[PDB]
Amino acid sequence: DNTVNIKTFDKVKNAFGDGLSQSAEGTFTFPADVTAVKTIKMFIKNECPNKTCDEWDRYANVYVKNKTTGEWYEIGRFITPYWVGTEKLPRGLEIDVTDFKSLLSGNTELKIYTETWLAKGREYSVDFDIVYGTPDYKYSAVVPVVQYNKSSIDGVPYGKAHTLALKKNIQLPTNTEKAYLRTTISGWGHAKPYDAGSRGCAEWCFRTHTIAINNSNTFQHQLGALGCSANPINNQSPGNWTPDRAGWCPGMAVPTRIDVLNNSLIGSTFSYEYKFQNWTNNGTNGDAFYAISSFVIAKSNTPISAPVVTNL
Numbered sequence: 001d002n003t004v005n006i007k008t009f010d011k012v013k014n015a016f017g018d019g020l021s022q023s024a025e026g027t028f029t030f031p032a033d034v035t036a037v038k039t040i041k042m043f044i045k046n047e048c049p050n051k052t053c054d055e056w057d058r059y060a061n062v063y064v065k066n067k068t069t070g071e072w073y074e075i076g077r078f079i080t081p082y083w084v085g086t087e088k089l090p091r092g093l094e095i096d097v098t099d100f101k102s103l104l105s106g107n108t109e110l111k112i113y114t115e116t117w118l119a120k121g122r123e124y125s126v127d128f129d130i131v132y133g134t135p136d137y138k139y140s141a142v143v144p145v146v147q148y149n150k151s152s153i154d155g156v157p158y159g160k161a162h163t164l165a166l167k168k169n170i171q172l173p174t175n176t177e178k179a180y181l182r183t184t185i186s187g188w189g190h191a192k193p194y195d196a197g198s199r200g201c202a203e204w205c206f207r208t209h210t211i212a213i214n215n216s217n218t219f220q221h222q223l224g225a226l227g228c229s230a231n232p233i234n235n236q237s238p239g240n241w242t243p244d245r246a247g248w249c250p251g252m253a254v255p256t257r258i259d260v261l262n263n264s265l266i267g268s269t270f271s272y273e274y275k276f277q278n279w280t281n282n283g284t285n286g287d288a289f290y291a292i293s294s295f296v297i298a299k300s301n302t303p304i305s306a307p308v309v310t311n312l
Contacts, residue, residue: 006030006128011047014060014114015121022121023113030108031130034101035138039131042076044112045092047123048085054118055083057239057250059152059186059291062126064100065109072111073142074149074293075100077184080114080122081231081251082239088232095253097128099182099297102140104128115151137177137299141306145170145181145272145294152188155289158202159191159281166274170296171308174267178299179307181211181259181272185221186248189288191281199246201279201288206246211259211294212273219259223247226255261296271312272296 012024042062046053058080063072076095086092097104114122145168148156156164172179187202195205211219225244233241233251241250248254274294281288296307 002132004031004130004132006130008110008128009112009124009126011123011125012112013121013123014112014116015119016117017119020119020121022116023111025109025111027107027109030104030106032106034105036132036134037098037101037130038133038135039096040098040101040104041129041131042095042097043092043127043129044076044078044086044095045125046080046085047087047125051083052120053085053122054116054120055239056080057082057241058122059115060122061113061149063111063113064103065111066103067108071144073100073103073144073295074147074184077149077186077254077291079248079250079252079254081233082236082241084233084235086233086251088235093253096256099140099142099295102142138301139303140297140299141304142295142297143306143309145296145309146274147293149291149293152186152291153289155188155291156276158187158189158276158288158290159279160287165311167312168272169269169310169312170272171269172266172298173304173307175300175302175304176266176298177301178263179261179266180297181219181261181294182297183211183221183257183259183292183294184254185209185223185257185290185292186254187223187246187288187290190285191288192285193282200285201281202290203245205279207277207279209277210275212271212275213261213265214270215273217275221257226252228252
């Protein structure tokens with residue numbers, strides 16, 4: 001029926017303690033040929049019966065390893081539900097990872113991490129649906145532009161000065177036909193000054209950030225209310241699961257933002273800059289951080305190299 005299912009992690013535990021590890025890795029067989037892949041959906045099941053897991057709403061993410069460079073690429077991010085797992089969703093939390101189809105081929109290394117601070121941890125099973133047909137572009141390649149995403153507090157400091165590069169140059173191959181960015185951003189903190197509604201940064205304060213291309217402000221990322229109260233994982237009581245955070249919810253995937261680049265840029269090197277909305281932390285209620293990954297995807301109907309990302 002045009003779909004293949006690949007089981008990967010199965011009952012893997014992310015936990016914190018002696019002889020325990022917040023991350024797990026494995027090597028899994030994916031089909032070799034991705035030329036007819038239209039869609040790849042990743043599904044993350046979190047098994048937490050009888051309050052046997054770290055009950056907090058923890059940052060968590062999944063990576064694929066680039067077989068040649070050894071670098072981990074974040075393919076999906078989520079926040080665990082409070083108290084319970086994903087059992088209200090029979091298939092788990094769903095994240096489209098089609099952008100990484102070039103890496104999800106043959107024997108492939110994956111990593112799953114949870115910012116869990118308890119031996120009880122969290123336990124997961126992860127599977128992938130690969131849907132075959134006729135993509136518009138036979139060939140794709142993906143590389144990171146920035147990744148400040150190892151944990152929520154390894155994000156980019158917000159409201160405080162910092163020396164992280166959020167400007168890069170990107171060279172797209174001349175035979176590119178279509179290019180775009182894929183960004184996942186989430187905020188931590190209840191730093192003051194508060195916005196209206198007693199909303200501190202960066203978990204709660206609604207913000208719109210901007211990607212500048214060749215210095216021109218081009219794409220806006222509104223980190224707004226997602227409707228946390230409507231979560232189908234609605235059995236998170238007595239955790240604080242219903243208020244809206246800026247651009248995320250407990251027990252939900254962090255949204256993936258897709259920004260399609262002008263074709264004029266193909267065959268050129270262009271600058272990327274991620275610009276955060278101006279704000280200053282007064283220091284009267286802790287720190288704020290934005291965990292962020294952003295990738296550039298090139299598609300073509302002739303074989304293509306990866307885009308090349310450099311520092312200024």
